[PDB]
């Protein structure tokens, strides 16, 4: 199937004591692979996953460099929006962004992106016909008529279909059988009196990767819902995950119920 190469970025205004924070982490698929974070001794853009750690100083250095170039670039952006909105320099302000390209089911480009959101809420987006942008708010319109002006729309096309791809595959090769290799779950149920009319039973899906699964209680045919309590899915230290779902079953009439866990590294019928 296909793949990601998204870059999620955060810059926060820390007004009073502290200069703006800068964080960029590049994810691969869901496999987290690079970071930068202005709150480190050596404000570094160094590894994650052993595989990135099998590269050298022209990827590190130019790209540590490249990031720092962004730190300052933003920290100017923060002052600007602040202006746009006519905000008082006082509290924190948050600038986020997700960037990237999805490789089609054959090794080229089936997707391309560019989001900006200021203080949780959409600000700018690049709309797919990688040329039109959309101004979310009243003041995203402002960059529109400039960002479009110069070549910051057209010059992107290239990053995406180009570099973002060209580059992207090196990664999807050096940490090949790493970025995948499913994790078979282990399950059980745990009956619990709640009480004497009924007995809550509960399903244990725990020990998996990828992050997804879909559990179910099937009362012999009918797939049960309204009796269903769902935990939504959550990571468990180890980087295993876990999930569970439950039902309020008539004390006595317990056995008549079926527990169902389905996940891609599990060959599980019914």
């Amino acid at each position: 199937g296909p793949h990601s190469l998204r870059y999620f970025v955060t810059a926060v205004s820390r007004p009073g004591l502290g200069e703006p924070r800068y964080m960029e982490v590049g994810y691969v698929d869901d496999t987290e692979f690079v970071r930068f974070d202005s709150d480190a001794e050596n404000p570094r853009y160094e590894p994650r996953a052993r595989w990135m750690e099998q590269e050298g100083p022209e990827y590190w250095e130019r790209e540590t460099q490249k990031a720092k170039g962004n730190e300052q670039s933003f920290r100017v952006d923060l002052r600007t929006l602040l202006g746009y909105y006519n905000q008082s320099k006082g509290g924190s302000h948050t600038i986020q962004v997700i960037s990237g390209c999805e490789v089609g089911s054959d090794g080229r480009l089936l997707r391309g992106y560019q989001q900006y959101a200021y203080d949780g809420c959409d600000y700018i987006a690049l709309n797919e016909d990688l040329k039109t942008w959309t101004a979310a708010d009243m003041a995203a319109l402002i960059t529109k008529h400039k960002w479009e002006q110069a070549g910051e729309a057209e010059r992107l096309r290239a990053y995406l279909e180009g570099t973002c791809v060209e580059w992207l595959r090196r990664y999807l090769k050096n940490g090949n059988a790493t970025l995948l290799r499913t994790d078979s779950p282990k399950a059980h149920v745990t009956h619990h009196s709640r009480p004497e009319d009924k007995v809550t039973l509960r399903c244990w899906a725990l020990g998996f990767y990828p992050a997804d699964i879909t559990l179910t209680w099937q009362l012999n045919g009918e797939e049960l819902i309204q009796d269903m309590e769902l935990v939504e899915t959550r990571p468990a230290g180890d980087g295993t995950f876990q999930k569970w779902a439950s039902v309020v079953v008539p004390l006595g009439k317990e056995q008549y119920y079926t527990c169902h866990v389905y996940h891609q590294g599990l060959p599980e019928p019914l």
């Binding site: 490249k66 962004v97 960037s99 400039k146």
Partner: peptide, 8 residues
């Protein structure tokens, strides 16, 4: 790779 974002 990384991008050199600017403008705003």
């Amino acid at each position: 790779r990384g991008y050199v974002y600017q403008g705003l």
